Design a binder for this molecule. Sequence first.
Ligand SMILES: Cc1cc2nc3c(=O)[nH]c(=O)nc-3n(C[C@H](O)[C@H](O)[C@H](O)COP(=O)(O)OP(=O)(O)OCC3O[C@@H](n4cnc5c(N)ncnc54)[C@H](O)[C@@H]3O)c2cc1C
Ligand SMILES: Cc1cc2nc3c(=O)[nH]c(=O)nc-3n(C[C@H](O)[C@H](O)[C@H](O)COP(=O)(O)OP(=O)(O)OCC3O[C@@H](n4cnc5c(N)ncnc54)[C@H](O)[C@@H]3O)c2cc1C
Ligand SMILES: O=C(O)[C@@H]1C[C@@H](O)CN1
Ligand SMILES: O=C(O)[C@@H]1C[C@@H](O)CN1
Lengths: 468, 468
Amino acid sequence: QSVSRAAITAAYRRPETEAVSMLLEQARLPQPVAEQAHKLAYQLADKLRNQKNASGRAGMVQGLLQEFSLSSQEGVALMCLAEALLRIPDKATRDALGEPLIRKGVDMAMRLMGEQFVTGETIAEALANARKLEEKGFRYSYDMLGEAALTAADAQAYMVSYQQAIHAIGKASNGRGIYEGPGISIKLSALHPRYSRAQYDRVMEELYPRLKSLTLLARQYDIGINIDAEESDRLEISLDLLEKLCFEPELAGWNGIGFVIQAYQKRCPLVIDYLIDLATRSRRRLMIRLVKGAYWDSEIKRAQMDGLEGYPVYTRKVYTDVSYLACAKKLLAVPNLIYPQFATHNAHTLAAIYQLAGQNYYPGQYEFQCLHGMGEPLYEQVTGKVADGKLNRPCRISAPVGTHETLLAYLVRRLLENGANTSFVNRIADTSLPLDELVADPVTAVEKLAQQEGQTGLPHPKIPLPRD
Amino acid sequence: QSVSRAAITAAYRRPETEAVSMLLEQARLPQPVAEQAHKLAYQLADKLRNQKNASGRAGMVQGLLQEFSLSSQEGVALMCLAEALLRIPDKATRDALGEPLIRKGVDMAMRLMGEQFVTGETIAEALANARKLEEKGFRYSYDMLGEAALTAADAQAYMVSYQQAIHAIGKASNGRGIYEGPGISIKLSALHPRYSRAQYDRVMEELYPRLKSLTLLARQYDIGINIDAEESDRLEISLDLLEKLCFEPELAGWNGIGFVIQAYQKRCPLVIDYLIDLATRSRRRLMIRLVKGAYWDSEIKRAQMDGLEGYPVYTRKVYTDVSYLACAKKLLAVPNLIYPQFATHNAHTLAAIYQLAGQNYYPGQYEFQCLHGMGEPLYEQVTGKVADGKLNRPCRISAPVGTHETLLAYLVRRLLENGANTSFVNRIADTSLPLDELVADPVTAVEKLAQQEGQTGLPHPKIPLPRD
Ligand SMILES: Cc1cc2nc3c(=O)[nH]c(=O)nc-3n(C[C@H](O)[C@H](O)[C@H](O)COP(=O)(O)OP(=O)(O)OCC3O[C@@H](n4cnc5c(N)ncnc54)[C@H](O)[C@@H]3O)c2cc1C
Ligand SMILES: Cc1cc2nc3c(=O)[nH]c(=O)nc-3n(C[C@H](O)[C@H](O)[C@H](O)COP(=O)(O)OP(=O)(O)OCC3O[C@@H](n4cnc5c(N)ncnc54)[C@H](O)[C@@H]3O)c2cc1C
Ligand SMILES: O=C(O)[C@@H]1C[C@@H](O)CN1
Ligand SMILES: O=C(O)[C@@H]1C[C@@H](O)CN1
């Protein structure tokens, strides 16, 4: 392997104490920057939590819950009485006074919960809904739902769906280009049957020509085409595919190839070193989506079953946060080689990147990204005019496109993401968690754990090594 | 009295059968127009009811509620099971498996429920919030809360608050003018102590100079100034004040004087005849807000206590709807004399006015109006570009300004309006009421009642004449 590819391989499952300790100083925000990040994060989070005065109203209730020492079901009774009294029109009057059921249930629960996350049933419908936010400075990436093709027929249908989508998105883009215009994202697992266990030779013979074909088509329309990151044991083959793609003569001088990297992997910073070298060698600017990672629960389960030396992902959420910040700095350092796209719904992460990107933002420096149904509220504070009290930073919304028949896997990942006690979007909804705790700096949090536990980067107490 | 003033007086409490029968043909929409009104009303109402697919989702539930014959608490249990199952990360695993308390309570209930209806605590705060919707084509009228001044000191404080508000609104308007720019609305009951029983001479000596002063100030800034309509026994004195105001030399050639008329009053069409004559004589275009009326519950109570010959308002809601349509046609007929401002949250009423206004709309022909916290959803379909799927008709939002100390009366009127089974905004939320019933034409509804009951315009069966 090349020097950079070899380094990736060696970092695959390196001990967490080692991995985290190495990231810490790369992730640490300079005192000035950290303060500004905190203030901005606090502000974003406060505005989000207090949208319709939710907190102000809460304070009003408790202010009476004590003046009468009433229970929850008590204060409510009083409000009910007060409401009835306020409905008296005249003040004087007021004053004076089998398995199919289970299978169907899961299917329906999936669809009801999934609606919030899906932009459209078809690409035409999705694209029709774009103007509203695009006119506000938002951008879109269309995510054709459906993954892990099991059969040759399945993969072919996905291929056809991508091609049609590119034509549609490309026509809608109308030459807006890879930055301001919409793009598409693809899953390699959709393009090859049984990708999960597919061998190198067959992937190169069969998947690659499909990847190349879609990419050439995207280039014809000048839209971004992003390669999604999936399970960790497919990282290596995805890099091999990316490597080959970047050297296609027909793509020379075109910077629309995108690639996701997952900060929850120990390999992430090493993947970045490789990508930097690849952009240099292939003479392009890569569009890189930095995400934390959507498959954590499965990654942990998988590793515990394979009984290997360790995990390919961190076991404490705060370590993934630290990894993201360290990786963000690396990406921001090389604007000639990478267009960083910072996917996050986390107010601290957003504010940290905003400060790390430095003075003198220009549109092509970077963008934020979010998932439809999750990020719009946060980014409505971010994308738009400074005069309107926004940050004037672009956000690209990932917009799922598909019917109920393709929704399951995506929906499950969203449930895990939204339901996890560790998730920012879960904690922001816990009004008992103080804002300062919510937007706490991850590097400092890691150092606090280190002082308490006796060393930096210990694994989660409840997630022992697979061999234990 | 003049011919027009005399006609108003004679119509004060005319029998409902007579009043309604007289309105019917003036209100009747030409077959073509009625159909277009129905289609548009249905569309507006459907989009409002189905915002986040509320109905589509409802249909999905019942589709299973029968396939298993499950109770409400039953289907819910299944969804709960399905949700837990969908939280299993790996599919294989899933598959295999005293009076102060009362006074305080009323105060707090008032404030919690009132927030949705109040734009700002102060005029500066209110004005700061205007750009968002103004940029979308909305307009504002600021409603300084506080009415029915009891003391001289009270009225003076209201007067000062209005003056300060005009300066603020006028500065914010910045010469946008009476149509495109914000205006203010005032209550005569705020400007004179014990207005409810005030005599003509004292009102002319004391209230009028205040009204004149505010109006001259509004003219200096070229903003609209609207006289609110209050209880029915103050209609006459309000007309006397308006009459005098319209002939002030300093207001000559200025068309910013506004006046509300209430369609629920039997006098409404006669007031319009008077206003038409007044605009002609005083050589101005009057800004007229046609509203249905906010004091119905109190009007009925008042009449039943005074034991008079009849009611000054209709006793069936559908009659008020008919009155509004008849009155709207009268206003639209005289664009040189009146700028009609159609206040309503009712999709049928809106659609009917839209069609009645005819072909070749121009911005200065008319506007719609709504209350903050009630009308924005409906009018988001209306104000804005045709290309964006809107109707391109302006709506002016009435924006209450004030603290909790001035909120009570306004809030109570909003509770009655929102809570009434007869209110459009209440019925649209009743998903068991078919859309077609919701947007049913009021003239046809009245004719249906007439055929069933044996004559047109009978009073509400539950609201006998006061002397009964
Ligand atoms: C536009 C877009 C494209 C995306 N593409 C991909 C993609 O191709 N592949 C993909 O994998 N994800 C992808 N993601 C999504 C992504 O990974 C999740 O949305 C993300 O991890 C949420 O991070 P956050 O900063 O919003 O929330 P945060 O609440 O701050 O962090 C959330 C998360 O931390 C991690 N985590 C949770 N618990 C632990 C733990 N105990 N130990 C270590 N880490 C933990 C997870 O990665 C997790 O999702 C994409 C997201 C967006 C917005
Ligand atoms: C910008 C603005 C300014 C306003 N200014 C004033 C004002 O100065 N004075 C004022 O009085 N109102 C004023 N109103 C408000 C107003 O009168 C109510 O908002 C209104 O009546 C609601 O009508 P609607 O078409 O939205 O609802 P709809 O549901 O179609 O009709 C509602 C109503 O019909 C009436 N009604 C209810 N029951 C009966 C019945 N049994 N018999 C007869 N009629 C019945 C009422 O007038 C009532 O509010 C204003 C409203 C707005 C938007
Ligand atoms: O599948 C997922 O969970 C993420 C989100 C999308 O952008 C696609 N990759
Ligand atoms: O007081 C009311 O109820 C109405 C609404 C405002 O426009 C003022 N008049």
